[PDB]
């Protein structure tokens, strides 16, 4: 659940 959130910020 946190991963997807951590990646979203990175990419965007």
The DSSP-derived string for 1-12 is -HHHHHHHHHH-
User: Given the structure tokens 């979203």, which residue do they identify?
Assistant: 8
Q: Give the determination technique.
A: NMR
End-to-end CA, the chain? 17
Say how far apart CA 4 and CA 1 lie, in whole Å: 6
Chain Cα centroid distance, residue 8: 3
Cα separations in angstroms, 4 against 11, 12: 11, 12
> In 10 A of CB 9, how many CB atoms?
7
Cα separations in angstroms, 3 against 10, 12: 11, 14
């Amino acid at each position: 659940i946190l991963g997807t959130i951590l990646g979203l910020l990175k990419g965007l």
